[PDB]
């Protein structure tokens, strides 16, 4: 994912930094597995004189779904931005190390 390109008298070619790529792979694996791990009915019937109980059951069922959908959409959108910033910071650390 990250690497070097060199050109000199003998030739020119690309390379790779294996230790930064391994650290990136470790963070990505832990992040996706944590997202999978944290977020680890058959239906009921009612007759005509229990409309209130039916409406309460639909309120519960439709209220949990909104919360879980929001939670999923928000977690994916924050972790994407964190991943991209993490990659940019890793490239900056390589440049600072070669500079130093």
């Amino acid at each position, epitope marked *: 994912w990250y690497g070097y390109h060199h050109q000199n008298e003998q030739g020119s070619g690309y390379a*790779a930094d294996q230790k930064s790529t391994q650290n990136a792979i470790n963070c990505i*694996t832990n992040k996706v597995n944590s997202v999978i791990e944290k977020m680890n009915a058959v239906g009921k019937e009612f007759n005509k004189l229990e409309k209130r109980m039916e409406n309460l059951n639909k309120k519960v069922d439709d209220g949990f779904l909104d919360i879980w959908t929001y939670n999923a959409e928000l977690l994916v959108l924050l972790e994407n931005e964190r991943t991209l910033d993490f990659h940019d910071s890793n490239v900056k650390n390589l440049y600072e190390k070669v500079k130093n």
Partner: antibody, heavy 128, light 105 residues
Framework: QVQLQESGPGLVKPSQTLSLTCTVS??????????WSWIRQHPGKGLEWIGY???????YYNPSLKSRVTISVDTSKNQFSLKLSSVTAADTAVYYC???????????????????????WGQGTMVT | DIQMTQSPSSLSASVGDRVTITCRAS??????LGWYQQKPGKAPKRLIY???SLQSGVPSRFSGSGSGTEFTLTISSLQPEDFATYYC?????????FGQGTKVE
């Protein structure tokens, strides 16, 4: 499935050179994350490392056996080859060719196919 | 020119025993070690990547630990198909050096 196999003469006199070819069947010489290596074992001894090559042509060889060694990769034929010399009775041994990955990716997030993260080894060829 | 050492060279135990086996290095190798299992007359196979991560398909009885100069491999329970020889391989520098070998019986 990727399979590595070896070809060689196996009848070498002292003070003469030796060549082996390890060939690939399946997904060919992939370009993303592998160390193509030759490792040897004498019958009656332990495992000893010969040397590895990356896809692009960079090579790294054992410091003790840096006398006459050559490794070469032909991408179009899906082959790589090893050249030794002065094969004596200590050098008559079993040779293995191996595909070692650079990274350990258990859940498949860098190398996409699950198989592409396997250290597939050769059958082994005894050369005397 | 880093050299490995293993002890003991011979392990003898019955079925169902725990075996803890050691690979020791002089230099400060940071988690760069793999365990190879060799059947008689057959190529070795990988078991552990980077001294603490198992390969996919490896049964859960094999475990590994250790860091720095020393590393250990633990087998919880034996089977009749576990007659093999185990090697430890380092890949810290560009030089690759194996273990001498430990026979199990």
């Amino acid at each position: 499935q990727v399979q590595l196999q070896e070809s060689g003469p196996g009848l070498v006199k002292p003070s003469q050179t030796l060549s082996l070819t390890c060939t690939v069947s399946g997904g060919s010489i992939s370009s993303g994350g592998y160390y193509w290596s030759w490792i040897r074992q004498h019958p009656g001894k332990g495992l000893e490392w010969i040397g590895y090559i990356y896809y692009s042509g960079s090579t790294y060889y054992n410091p003790s056996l840096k006398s006459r060694v050559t490794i070469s990769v032909d991408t179009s034929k899906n082959q790589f080859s090893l050249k030794l010399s002065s094969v004596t009775a200590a050098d008559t041994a079993v040779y293995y060719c191996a595909r070692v990955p650079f990274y350990y990716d258990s859940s498949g997030y860098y190398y996409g196919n699950a198989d592409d993260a396997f250290d597939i080894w050769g059958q082994g060829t005894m050369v005397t | 020119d880093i050299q490995m050492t293993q002890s003991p060279s011979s392990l003898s135990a019955s079925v169902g025993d725990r075996v803890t086996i050691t690979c020791r290095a002089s230099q400060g190798i940071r988690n760069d070690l793999g365990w190879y299992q060799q059947k008689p007359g057959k190529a070795p196979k990988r078991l552990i990547y980077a001294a603490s991560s198992l390969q996919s398909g490896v049964p859960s009885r094999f475990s590994g630990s250790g860091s720095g100069t020393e590393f250990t491999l633990t087998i919880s329970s034996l089977q009749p198909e576990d007659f093999a020889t185990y090697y430890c391989l380092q890949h810290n520098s560009y030089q690759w050096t194996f273990g001498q070998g430990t026979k199990v019986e």
